[PDB]
Amino acid sequence: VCEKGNFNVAHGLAWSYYIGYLRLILPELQARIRTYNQHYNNLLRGAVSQRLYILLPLDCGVPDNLSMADPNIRFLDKLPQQTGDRAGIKDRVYSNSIYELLENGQRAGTCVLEYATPLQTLFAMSQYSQAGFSREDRLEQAKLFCRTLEDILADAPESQNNCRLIAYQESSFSLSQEVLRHLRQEE
Amino acid sequence: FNVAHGLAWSYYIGYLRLILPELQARIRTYNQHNLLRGAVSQRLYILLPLDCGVPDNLSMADPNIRFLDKLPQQTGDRAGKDRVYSNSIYELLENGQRAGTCVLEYATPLQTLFAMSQYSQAGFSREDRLEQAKLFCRTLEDILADAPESQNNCRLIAYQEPADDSSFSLSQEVLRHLRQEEK
Ligand SMILES: Nc1nc(=O)c2ncn([C@@H]3O[C@@H]4COP(=O)(O)O[C@H]5[C@@H](O)[C@H](n6cc(-c7ccc(-c8ccc9ccccc9c8)cc7)c7c(N)ncnc76)O[C@@H]5COP(=O)(O)O[C@@H]3[C@@H]4O)c2[nH]1
């Protein structure tokens, strides 16, 4: 019933997110985006941004369909896939989805956008009795996850201007506006 | 309580509860586009090496475990489109000849506990790793015992291989479970 427990849970999930995904995809991400831009997206104001944008809703409410969370977020395409032999599974697949961000009926941005999948584990553990966690535990673990992940990425050699965390609290809220603000701060 | 609790819950929530309900069907679609060769056990076999030593290719754990084929892929839109869930069908050799076939893999979260033991910023000792590996196994087993998505469709094999022990055949151990099952 302590924070040390809320800390250990988030610490492990943040490391898992780095070890099993970010350290493996971030190094070839900008090649994949550059490839996409050069070959399949010659739109001079429509280029896919060079960073993976990771949505960290602090209530850990993660829809599976991002486009449905905002009429102004439209699925556009997938990057070229990346495969790996992982833990005795041949060709485990790593894929990333490109979204268009609309504003005043116009395209305002294009980016690789996704929620941090591990927040779904923090939500489930808040909902399942066997896991033994309260909403207040979930909110603490979500904050500790984002902080651990930032500290990890700040020192990680695979993170070099290719990743951006978007943490926010969540009706009146536009997720596209939340991402557009971060995107527009890049260039 | 600790790191393993989140890892065990993550493995159930993000993988087992999603793939196990559909596993039985995928194995039939495989057997309909393979009976003359030998049927694949209808259960996902998950290896839990407690030393957290998890080669990405199983033949390097034991050369008698050979990749035969990949089961039909399962794709799911997850956390924002067509995330692919893939599984690998292996043959187990006895005296250079196929003794069995199953869907077989390591529990990937054990590689996290290993890499955490290796990164200074994780503050994770090798004693922490063994302790957390056992907690992972027990937490996962406790979850799967009450999980509705596990209806005789999964088998966990937890084991401690001591250092440099030629007395251990992973192939034989899996075959022992496969032979016990058919009985
Ligand atoms: N965004 C993202 N894409 C990835 O491809 C990926 N891969 C690992 N991770 C995270 O990195 C951390 C450590 O990973 P790990 O392998 O160590 O532990 C895993 C693993 O044992 C098992 N498991 C999970 C997956 C899996 C498949 C697809 C997605 C996904 C999610 C959002 C997307 C958004 C857009 C496009 C594509 C998207 C794809 C996520 C997980 C998986 C698989 N395909 N085959 C075999 N076993 C599997 O369940 C454990 C917990 O899974 P969790 O879902 O919580 O997400 C894990 C985890 O938190 C990923 N995140």
Author numbering:
A (entry chain A): 147 to 316, 321 to 337
B (entry chain B): 153 to 185, 188 to 234, 236 to 338
Give verbatim excerpts from the published study on this entry.
Cyclic dinucleotides (CDNs) are second messengers that activate stimulator of interferon genes (STING). The cyclic GMP–AMP synthase (cGAS)–stimulator of interferon genes (STING) pathway is an important player in detecting damage-associated (DAMPs) and pathogen-associated molecular patterns (PAMPs).1−4 Upon dsDNA detection in cytosol, cGAS synthetizes a STING ligand 2′3′-cGAMP (1a, cyclic [G(2′,5′)pA(3′,5′)p] with mixed 2′–5′ and 3′–5′ phosphodiester linkages). To understand the interactions of large moieties in position 7 of 7-deazaadenine in 2′3′-cGARMPs, we crystallized human wild-type STING truncated to residues 140–379 in complexes with 5f, 5k, 5l, and 5m using our improved STING crystallization protocols. The binding site is formed at the interface of two STING monomers and is covered by two “lids” (residues 227–241).
Considering the results for 5k, we designed a substitution with 4-(2-naphthyl)phenyl (5l). This modification resulted in nearly the same ΔTm and EC50s despite the change from phenyl to naphthyl, which might cause more significant collisions with the lid of the STING binding pocket. To explain potent activities of compounds 5k–m, we solved the X-ray crystallographic structure for the complex of STING and corresponding CDNs. For 5l with a 4-(2-naphthyl)phenyl substitution, we preserved the interactions that were observed for 5k; however, naphthyl substitution clashed with Ile235 of the lid, making this residue disordered. Despite this clash, 5l exhibited a slightly better stabilization of complex in DSF when compared to 5k.
